[PDB]
Design a protein around this ligand. Structure first.
Ligand code: MG
Ligand code: MG
Ligand code: MG
Ligand code: MG
Ligand code: MG
Ligand code: MG
Ligand code: MG
Ligand code: MG
Ligand code: MG
Ligand code: MG
Ligand code: MG
Ligand code: MG
Ligand code: MG
Ligand code: MG
Ligand code: MG
Ligand code: MG
Ligand code: MG
Ligand code: MG
Ligand code: MG
Ligand code: MG
Ligand code: MG
Ligand code: MG
Ligand code: MG
Ligand code: MG
Ligand code: MG
Ligand code: MG
Ligand code: MG
Ligand code: MG
Ligand code: MG
Ligand code: MG
Ligand code: MG
Ligand code: MG
Ligand code: MG
Ligand code: MG
Ligand code: MG
Ligand code: MG
Ligand code: MG
Ligand code: MG
Ligand code: MG
Ligand code: MG
Ligand code: MG
Ligand code: MG
Ligand code: MG
Ligand code: MG
Ligand code: MG
Ligand code: MG
Ligand code: MG
Ligand code: MG
Ligand code: MG
Ligand code: MG
Ligand code: MG
Ligand code: MG
Lengths: 60, 129, 394
RNA sequence: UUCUGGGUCGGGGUGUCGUGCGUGGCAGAGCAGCGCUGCGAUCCAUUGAAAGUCAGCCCUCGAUCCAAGUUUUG
RNA sequence: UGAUCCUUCGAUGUCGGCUCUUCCUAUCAUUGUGAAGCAGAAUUCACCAAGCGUUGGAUUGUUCACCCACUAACAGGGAACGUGAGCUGGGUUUAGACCGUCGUGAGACAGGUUAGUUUUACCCUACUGAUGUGAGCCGUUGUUGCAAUAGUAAUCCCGCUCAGUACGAGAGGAACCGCGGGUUCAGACAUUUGGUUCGUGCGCUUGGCUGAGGAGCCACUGGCGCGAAGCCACCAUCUGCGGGAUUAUGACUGAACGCCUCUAAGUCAGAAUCCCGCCUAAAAGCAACGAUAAGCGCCGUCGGAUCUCCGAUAGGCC
RNA sequence: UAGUGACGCGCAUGAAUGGAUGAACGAGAUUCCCACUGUCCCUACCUGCUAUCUAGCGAAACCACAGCCAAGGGAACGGGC
RNA sequence: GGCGUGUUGGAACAAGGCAGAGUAAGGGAAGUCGGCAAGUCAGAUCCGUAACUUCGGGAUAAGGAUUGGCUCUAAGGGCU
RNA sequence: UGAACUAUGCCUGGGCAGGGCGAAGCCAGGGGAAACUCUGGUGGAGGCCCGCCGCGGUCCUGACGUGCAAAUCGGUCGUCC
RNA sequence: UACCGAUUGAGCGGCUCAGUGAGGUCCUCGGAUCGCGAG
């Protein structure tokens, strides 16, 4: 069970869609909303529903 | 050999040459092993050997027909473990009829479906992913 | 005059005519051949298509590139509550085909089984089998009843069983029961009648009809799509954009002579809702329904030897457009004809299963239970609350 | 067409988007009046909040209703 | 391609391509075999055989050619030189115009070039689906089935092992069984990925409007991001099968013809063919079984007698 | 077999029946390249107006009689023989 | 200021059409006689613009950057 | 017998947003020994350019094709001192 | 031996437009951790 590279959620073996770049880094995305935001160069710490945001502002 | 993958490189697709041969593009003109339908274009995925022509590169390479092998593609193909993997660019490497490459290095990752079929391409692969 | 470049035909002529099936429930058109050496058993069963999920299992296949590695296989859950045997029928072989010899029904028939005998149950005095059930009580009528069973053991070569599904235990609002003749392929006619006489008004679970890692045939009616064009019904090539008077048609529907349209020419009509039969549908898991063991319900019909969780086969929010399955379900590999909550008639295979893929043993490692009503990401509600924490609704 | 049964709302679950109105702040490029007050895109807390979710999603049994009678058949 | 001029000039729309179906075999490949100047590999000749497949492209309006790659192979044809109320008009084949040659000229060209309206189905069959129909009625109505007959579907390749073995002086170099995938095709399916989204679901936003905030509307769906449910894609996933008589052919026994002989009598092995199973449909074809409303049958084939119809037949189910 | 630059015993180019050239210009003809795109691979989904059903209203072309096929003969391609 | 959607209402949302110049994974003219069709580009500001030419042009050539909202600053007037 | 359509001419009236490149002439500042030159601004020329109404009618060989119409409709397109 | 020559001829270098921009350095605040302070 991998962790999503954008939202930080857990990706189960059936779901997800990973994406490798030319530099050699592989990223796992839970759904197409996280993938569309990652390719759009959005920042997870600014996206309000990301675990990186909730860990940033100490919501949990 | 390998299982079936989502083909995403029909004929007439220029892909980035990813070795130190001197070429920059690979204009796919056909695919090995394609029988053919009435109006179907021969498409190719990773690991498939294709005949391609160079459009940008050294003058001693861009007017001939070279047997290439696709190593990356942007069309997400499903592996047997439920993984849909896709790269950010379509890439190939010029090889011989026996599978031996012409260059010595490969710029970027090489798909595992292409590294297991061609042992000569995996030996010069920076990272197999 | 010949066609310029050769191309294979569009569609199969062996599935004509492509019409709406006049029978909503699948029909077993050929039961497996009898083997009088095996014990008496059933050869078919009725299920209901609940939904689909995907599992994770390690494949032990010597020679493959995926041997000793985990895969993700799409499965289909078919809820199969136990069926109650109500009648016994025998057939006699005639030089013009089989012929129904005589049918014998049980004394007590459930109320959901009599609904099949009526078209308007709400305004009908439910009098079906009211004078027939008096044979099992009168001493004279019991004598003639013994004459009918003893006649089947002598003049019949194929004995079947009339059984119905308990749709009282299903999410659908339908209350009727699907009757079906399940043929006994066990042994002697005398043994099959005695086996079918003691099983009247009794339930038969799915664990007795089929078994683990078994390839069965699934007969059912596909999903309808109404009147569809020739490019959607026969998958012909779409004409170019500049085509006047339509581009989603067939250009030439035949030559001048014969001066008629051939039945093999692809035309526009009603596609879907056809009767189909698919073979080699391997069973991956035979789940157990909900039952109170020590006073509290159990839902371990989705936990595996490698998971050891406490989750049921029902995903979060139940199966979309179906409901939740609480009965003995049957998990089949791959797709199955029909929509959700569609009646399926399972059947044992006619062929001999000796291939490397047919006798393969399945060891499930993980059964997915994420919500199919969207991009679900939590297997259980307890995991959803543990990860997200407390919400404002508390 | 009353061992009851069937609807309409509501509740819960699920999922979609994404942190609502209001209120509070010595957060805020600054700026204008007499430390204070006003103007001010945005930011922060309340607030993974708000909204909508079967009409072809799932489960209730909480609320309040409903039970009549077209045509014809030996 | 001619020859002819029988049919058609009160009109049979005419070249090629596209599309789609079917047939033929004079067989390119695959299945089963025979032959060699068949060692193997490759190839050639021939036989049963049309089940199945026979490609993507550059140039040309072109059929026809030529080349580039792929491939088991990229075989040859017919069906009004298949197919314009199916399409596309590129060509040819009205009127405009240019050139070349020809003509004193108007004009000609079977020479080149450019622009040039492609009309109508609602009728009858055929076909595709969709209601329903034997009506003679103690039959009406329902459930579970049987089955005539018609359709019929699977195809081909590669990798591993056999094996670097048989074979060959070498160079080279197979095959069966088994295993793992794929091509083409077929039938489905939406867990997953992807497409669509006017649940106009949620956020945001441009111009304007309601005095402003809040809440919203208008611009034939204002625009943008994400997106449920459905539907959907070799753009995701799943499934696709067994016998029988035999053809070509190779043989057994055994005469004709003291021998010999696969044939004359009698037998055996035998295939992508054929038939059937599997699968799809279900008949002016049918069975088992449930219930059948003073009203509605039977009983007592005795009806004791009355009326109406419709066939025959004129001892026999030996 | 296209386009362009050259070659010219040119069937049948050629000098106001005007030759050669030409910046700018063109809803003129033609070729290649970059970008772009459902033109295509290979189709799928949504929407508006129709088709569809219904109340009202309500035509026309056309028509020897008509309308299931195979083969045969025939005015040498029948629907009827 | 004018009007009831242009010679009719109601119920459905099948095929097939016309239109919205609807949208689209990967490839990007392999389609086709032919980039037909529509797709990209598009305003404005600041930069930068060749071959050729009749010196007028080519030229918005080509090729780049910037653009919202808000709070300020600076410069450009008249009259007594 | 017709120029109520259309072709050409004459008389007398009417009409043609908003922008762009920006010619002669002129002013000023620099270079010169004279011949005469260079920069900025001004000026507003044209069968000039983008383009609305107008006026035309390319392409889709779109819609329509017993039509709204015995020639029309939509997008696109030519021109607009 | 040089020259003209369609072939947007081809190759190899120098300096640069624009975009992307690794890594230091400072500045704002950030406090794992340690004994108000060091970090
Ligand atoms: Mg084609
Ligand atoms: Mg039920
Ligand atoms: Mg047309
Ligand atoms: Mg779902
Ligand atoms: Mg809001
Ligand atoms: Mg509906
Ligand atoms: Mg004649
Ligand atoms: Mg033959
Ligand atoms: Mg010979
Ligand atoms: Mg001929
Ligand atoms: Mg013809
Ligand atoms: Mg026509
Ligand atoms: Mg034609
Ligand atoms: Mg025709
Ligand atoms: Mg023409
Ligand atoms: Mg010509
Ligand atoms: Mg002409
Ligand atoms: Mg000519
Ligand atoms: Mg050797
Ligand atoms: Mg999706
Ligand atoms: Mg606004
Ligand atoms: Mg308007
Ligand atoms: Mg709009
Ligand atoms: Mg989207
Ligand atoms: Mg046999
Ligand atoms: Mg013989
Ligand atoms: Mg035999
Ligand atoms: Mg070309
Ligand atoms: Mg030339
Ligand atoms: Mg001459
Ligand atoms: Mg002359
Ligand atoms: Mg001349
Ligand atoms: Mg112009
Ligand atoms: Mg012009
Ligand atoms: Mg031009
Ligand atoms: Mg002009
Ligand atoms: Mg006739
Ligand atoms: Mg439609
Ligand atoms: Mg359209
Ligand atoms: Mg696309
Ligand atoms: Mg072509
Ligand atoms: Mg082409
Ligand atoms: Mg165009
Ligand atoms: Mg130019
Ligand atoms: Mg005037
Ligand atoms: Mg210009
Ligand atoms: Mg205009
Ligand atoms: Mg106009
Ligand atoms: Mg005119
Ligand atoms: Mg027009
Ligand atoms: Mg037209
Ligand atoms: Mg029409």
């Amino acid at each position: 069970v991998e962790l999503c590279s954008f939202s930080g959620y857990k990706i189960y073996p059936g779901h997800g869609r990973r994406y490798a770049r030319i530099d050699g880094k592989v990223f796992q995305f839970l759904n197409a909303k996280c993938e569309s935001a990652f390719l759009s160069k959005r920042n997870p710490r600014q996206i309000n529903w990301t675990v990186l945001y909730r860990r940033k502002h100490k919501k949990g | 050999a390998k299982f079936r993958i989502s083909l995403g490189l029909p004929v007439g697709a220029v892909i980035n040459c990813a070795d130190n041969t001197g070429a920059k593009n690979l204009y796919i003109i056909s695919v090995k092993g394609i029988k053919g339908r009435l109006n179907r274009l021969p498409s190719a995925g990773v690991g498939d050997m294709v005949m391609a022509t160079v459009k940008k590169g050294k003058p001693e390479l861009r007017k001939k027909v070279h047997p290439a092998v696709v190593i990356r593609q942007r069309k997400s193909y499903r592996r047997k473990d439920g993984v849909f993997l896709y790269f950010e660019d379509n890439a190939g490497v010029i090889v011989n009829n026996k599978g031996e490459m012409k260059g010595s290095a490969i710029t970027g990752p090489v798909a595992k479906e292409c590294a297991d079929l061609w042992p000569r391409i995996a030996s010069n692969a920076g990272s197999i992913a | 005059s010949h066609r310029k470049f050769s191309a294979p035909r569009h569609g199969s002529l062996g599935f004509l005519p492509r019409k709406r099936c006049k029978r909503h429930r699948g029909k077993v058109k050929s039961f497996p051949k009898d083997d009088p050496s095996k014990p008496v058993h059933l050869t078919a069963f009725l299920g209901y298509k609940a939904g689909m999920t995907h599992i994770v299992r390690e494949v032990d296949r010597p020679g493959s590139k995926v041997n000793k590695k985990e895969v993700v296989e799409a499965v289909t859950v078919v809820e199969t509550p136990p069926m109650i045997v109500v009648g016994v029928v025998g057939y006699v072989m005639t030089p013009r085909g089989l012929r129904s010899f005589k049918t014998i029904f049980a004394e007590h028939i459930s109320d959901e089984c009599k609904r099949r005998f009526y078209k308007n149950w709400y305004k009908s005095k439910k009098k079906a089998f009211t004078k027939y059930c008096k044979r099992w009580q009168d001493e004279e009528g019991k004598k003639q009843l013994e004459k009918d069973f003893s006649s089947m053991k002598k003049y019949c070569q194929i004995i079947r069983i009339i059984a119905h599904t308990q749709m009282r235990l299903l999410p659908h609002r339908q209350k009727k029961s699907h009757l079906m003749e399940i043929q006994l392929n066990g042994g002697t006619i005398s043994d099959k009648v005695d086996w079918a006489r003691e099983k009247l008004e009794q339930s038969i679970p799915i664990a007795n009809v089929f078994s683990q890692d078994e390839m069965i045939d699934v007969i059912g009616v596909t999903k309808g799509h109404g009147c569809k064009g020739v490019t959607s019904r026969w998958h012909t090539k779409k004409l170019p954009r500049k085509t006047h008077r339509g581009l989603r048609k067939v250009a030439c529907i035949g030559a001048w002579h014969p001066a008629r349209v051939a039945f093999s020419v692809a035309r526009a009509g009603q596609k879907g809702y056809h009767h189909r039969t698919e073979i080699n549908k391997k069973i991956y898991k035979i789940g157990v329904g909900y039952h109170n063991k020590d006073g509290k319900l159990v839902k371990n019909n989705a936990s595996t030897d490698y998971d050891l969780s406490n989750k049921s086969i029902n995903p979060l929010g139940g199966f979309v457009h179906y409901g939740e399955v609480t009965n003995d379900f049957l998990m089949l590999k791959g797709c199955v004809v029909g929509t959700k909550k569609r009646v399926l008639t399972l059947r044992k295979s006619l062929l001999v299963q000796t291939s490397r893929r047919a006798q393969e043993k399945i060891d499930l490692k993980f059964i997915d239970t994420t919500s199919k009503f969207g991009h679900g990401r939590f297997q259980t509600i307890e995991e959803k609350k543990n990860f997200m924490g407390p919400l404002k609704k508390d």
